[PDB]
Amino acid sequence: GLLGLAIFDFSQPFASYLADQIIVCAREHHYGVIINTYGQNEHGLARAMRQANNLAADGWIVFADHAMGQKMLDQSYPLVLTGDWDAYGKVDQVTMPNVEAMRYTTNRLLDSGYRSIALFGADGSLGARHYRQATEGTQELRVQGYMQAYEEHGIEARMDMLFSGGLLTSDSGVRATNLMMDQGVRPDAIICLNDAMALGALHQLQVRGIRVPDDVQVVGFDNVPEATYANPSLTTIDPHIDSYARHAVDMLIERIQGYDGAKRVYTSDFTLVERSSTSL
Amino acid sequence: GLLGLAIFDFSQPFASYLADQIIVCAREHHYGVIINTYGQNEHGLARAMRQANNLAADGWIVFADHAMGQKMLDQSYPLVLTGDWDAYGKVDQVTMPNVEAMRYTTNRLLDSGYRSIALFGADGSLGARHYRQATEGTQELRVQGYMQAYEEHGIEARMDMLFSGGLLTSDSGVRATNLMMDQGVRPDAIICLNDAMALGALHQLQVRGIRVPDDVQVVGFDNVPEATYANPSLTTIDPHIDSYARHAVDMLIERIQGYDGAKRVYTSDFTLVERSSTSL
């Protein structure tokens, strides 16, 4: 048996980590894995879904990174969606506990006395209503959870405390740090929407004279291997990538083998893994 | 057109970085890329070479991580070898300047007054003759260059100054740091055979109270993106992965399109990129 994985590119550590876990899980089922990337083409994801028709894999896991209209997920091969975008029940999908993990973690920071929390990885200019009402999106749902924690504490979350470097990379984490510091903002804590951004932020904060955690608490999201070896080691939301991969692979193989139940949504659990970049 | 890339797994940053560069290069030629991994199978590389017969790619770049007898590289599809192992002229191959870059860098350390240099990522118990006489191997040729720099300075390199954590990962860099420190060794400098090991070493040195660079100079190899964001930022040998990928892709596409000259060996150039983890 042969499974396909479609991802944008390998530029950030999470793609490597997810792919490796899918490969391990797939091997437990005696399936191989081939990887197609789609970030190198305009309308790239659609082209990869078409290319899958002529590849050898028996079915596909697709990690989407943007919204799709309620057609692309209508394919003739077995297909499981991963990522934070809605499949509208066209296929099984696996996702992370984006709202809950961010609400929990922002609440922990607030309850530990860190009242001013910047968020790296989202555009505040999209407005509070967009985030409050969102039903899909990586950035959107993670912001939503952060906003809910503020609301639970009787405080309005401020769009001016969201900083975006553009993409979700270490270089964007550096850019978001500069944007925030250049605006004179010196917060109690920063939550980054992935570990790549947090690793960039740890670097640029230290370069510009800010001590972590003594001046600013820093939290990431994913618990990629890199987070263990950072200096200081990185506190991060672990969305249980082992279980996430296991569900994606089990669901896809079930469909390849004829499983015909209604399409499902699985949401992984999470753990806040505390390391040296916070002092909660 | 469709190119295949076979690599062991994505567990360390270099595999991501090389794959992404191959994808960019391939896209410039209007070729896609599919990735097969082989580390998840016993005799894995041989199985991937066989699987390639039934995949859709028009030709393969294979990144080998161990020696092959002077049969595996005899295939019916176009094939270019990458990595530090000998193809014996069966196929075109692209490699890094393993001896020269390590000799240059070890000489820079010695000439700057850092006389005691540990090497992380090789087994000293293999003996000096094995390293002096080697004609292939990542570990072997990099050690060979380090030994030549010592010899140029009239000093015998010591096998007891090589530390291996097993594999070439960040976790092995942590293990090699513990092995070295537990033996009471406090060197002037450490050269790690890849950046993943150096990033682990930067972490474990700091955890155990060793300042980089004030107590120990630290150098890596690859100049993966991570090295820019380390704390302290990582001095590293850059083996010109852009040119390495460009040559692998150009050679493979040439063979797919009928190029019939003798098989070639390309060796990339190198630059020592100095950052905060050294003070040369």
Side-chain angles (χ1 to χ4, degrees), chain A residues 1-26 28-41 44-46 48-69 72-114 116-155 157-210 212-280, chain B residues 1-26 28-41 44-46 48-69 72-114 116-155 157-210 212-280:
Chain A
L2 174 60
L3 310 180
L5 171 62
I7 63 158
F8 184 93
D9 66 18
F10 292 98
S11 57
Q12 304 316 303
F14 173 79
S16 285
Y17 181 50
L18 176 63
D20 282 342
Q21 289 291 327
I22 288 172
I23 295 157
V24 174
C25 283
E28 297 174 351
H29 293 264
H30 307 275
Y31 271 77
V33 178
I34 58 165
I35 301 170
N36 201 5
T37 69
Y38 63 81
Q40 71 295 336
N41 299 312
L45 184 55
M49 320 270 348
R50 301 189 298 260
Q51 288 168 349
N53 292 132
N54 307 122
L55 294 177
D58 296 315
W60 287 82
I61 296 165
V62 170
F63 189 98
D65 64 2
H66 71 80
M68 299 156 289
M72 166 162 330
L73 299 179
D74 287 319
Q75 302 295 338
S76 60
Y77 46 82
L79 177 60
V80 173
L81 182 73
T82 51
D84 305 318
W85 305 96
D86 206 336
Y88 300 99
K90 295 184 167 56
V91 294
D92 291 325
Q93 72 174 122
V94 176
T95 199
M96 295 179 198
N98 290 309
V99 179
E100 187 182 358
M102 287 293 296
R103 190 178 57 245
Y104 175 88
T105 298
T106 302
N107 277 335
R108 285 288 305 277
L109 285 161
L110 294 169
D111 289 339
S112 290
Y114 302 110
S116 184
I117 305 166
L119 185 155
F120 282 8
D123 181 5
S125 77
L126 299 186
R129 183 184 292 279
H130 170 81
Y131 291 112
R132 284 169 45 72
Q133 296 179 176
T135 52
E136 69 182 327
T138 302
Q139 295 163 293
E140 274 77 9
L141 291 176
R142 290 181 189 172
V143 176
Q144 184 176 109
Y146 160 95
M147 296 176 69
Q148 288 172 359
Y150 268 99
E151 189 186 26
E152 293 181 350
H153 288 79
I155 297 166
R158 282 183 296 152
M159 287 305 95
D160 72 6
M161 292 294 284
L162 273 57
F163 300 90
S164 191
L167 299 174
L168 305 169
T169 62
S170 295
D171 180 70
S172 68
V174 169
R175 187 147 50 252
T177 299
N178 287 332
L179 280 162
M180 176 194 83
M181 294 188 65
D182 285 358
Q183 290 163 220
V185 171
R186 298 291 190 282
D188 302 312
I190 301 165
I191 295 169
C192 296
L193 293 197
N194 70 13
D195 283 349
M197 291 194 76
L199 296 164
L202 289 180
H203 182 69
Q204 187 63 8
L205 291 164
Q206 169 271 114
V207 162
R208 284 185 67 175
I210 305 304
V212 180
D214 282 350
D215 295 323
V216 185
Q217 306 280 304
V218 175
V219 180
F221 196 125
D222 284 338
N223 197 25
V224 297
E226 283 76 356
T228 292
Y229 311 99
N231 303 305
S233 55
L234 175 68
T235 291
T236 178
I237 292 163
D238 185 329
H240 291 204
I241 295 306
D242 288 7
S243 175
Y244 184 100
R246 181 187 298 272
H247 281 76
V249 170
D250 283 356
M251 287 173 150
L252 180 57
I253 296 181
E254 287 157 11
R255 297 294 176 181
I256 292 165
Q257 295 176 351
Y259 185 81
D260 68 351
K263 308 305 196 306
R264 299 164 285 185
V265 177
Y266 173 69
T267 305
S268 59
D269 295 328
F270 74 92
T271 303
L272 178 65
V273 177
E274 295 174 56
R275 299 199 174 95
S276 293
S277 68
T278 56
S279 54
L280 301 178
Chain B
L2 174 60
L3 310 180
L5 171 62
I7 63 158
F8 184 93
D9 66 18
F10 292 98
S11 57
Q12 304 316 303
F14 173 79
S16 285
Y17 181 50
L18 176 63
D20 282 342
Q21 289 291 327
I22 288 172
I23 295 157
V24 174
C25 283
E28 297 174 351
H29 293 264
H30 307 275
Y31 271 77
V33 178
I34 58 165
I35 301 170
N36 201 5
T37 69
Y38 63 81
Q40 71 295 336
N41 299 312
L45 184 55
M49 320 270 348
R50 301 189 298 260
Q51 288 168 349
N53 292 132
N54 307 122
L55 295 177
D58 296 315
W60 287 82
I61 296 165
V62 170
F63 189 98
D65 64 2
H66 71 80
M68 299 156 289
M72 166 162 330
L73 299 179
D74 287 319
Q75 302 295 338
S76 60
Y77 46 82
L79 177 60
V80 173
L81 182 73
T82 51
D84 305 318
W85 305 96
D86 206 336
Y88 300 99
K90 295 184 167 56
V91 294
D92 291 325
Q93 72 174 122
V94 176
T95 199
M96 295 179 198
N98 290 309
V99 179
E100 187 182 358
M102 287 293 296
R103 190 178 57 245
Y104 175 88
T105 298
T106 302
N107 277 335
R108 285 288 305 277
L109 285 161
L110 294 169
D111 289 339
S112 290
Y114 302 110
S116 184
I117 305 166
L119 185 155
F120 282 8
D123 181 5
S125 77
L126 299 186
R129 183 184 292 279
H130 170 81
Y131 291 112
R132 284 169 45 72
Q133 296 179 176
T135 52
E136 69 182 327
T138 302
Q139 295 163 293
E140 274 77 9
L141 291 176
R142 290 181 189 172
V143 176
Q144 184 176 109
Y146 160 95
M147 296 176 69
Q148 288 172 359
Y150 268 99
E151 189 186 26
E152 293 181 350
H153 288 79
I155 297 166
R158 282 183 296 152
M159 287 305 95
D160 72 6
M161 292 294 284
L162 273 57
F163 300 90
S164 191
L167 299 174
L168 305 169
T169 62
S170 295
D171 180 70
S172 68
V174 169
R175 187 147 50 252
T177 299
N178 287 332
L179 280 162
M180 176 194 83
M181 294 188 65
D182 285 358
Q183 290 163 220
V185 171
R186 298 291 190 282
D188 302 312
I190 301 165
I191 295 169
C192 296
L193 293 197
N194 70 13
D195 283 349
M197 291 194 76
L199 296 164
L202 289 180
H203 182 69
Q204 187 63 8
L205 291 164
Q206 169 271 114
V207 162
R208 284 185 67 175
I210 305 304
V212 180
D214 282 350
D215 295 323
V216 185
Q217 306 280 304
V218 175
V219 180
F221 196 125
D222 284 338
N223 197 25
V224 297
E226 283 76 356
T228 292
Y229 311 99
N231 303 305
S233 55
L234 175 68
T235 291
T236 178
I237 292 163
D238 185 329
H240 291 204
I241 295 306
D242 288 7
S243 175
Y244 184 100
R246 181 187 298 272
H247 281 76
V249 170
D250 283 356
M251 287 173 150
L252 180 57
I253 296 181
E254 287 157 11
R255 297 294 176 181
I256 292 165
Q257 295 176 351
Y259 185 81
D260 68 351
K263 308 305 196 306
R264 299 164 285 185
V265 177
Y266 173 69
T267 305
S268 59
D269 295 328
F270 74 92
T271 303
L272 178 65
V273 177
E274 295 174 56
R275 299 199 174 95
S276 293
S277 68
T278 56
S279 54
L280 301 178

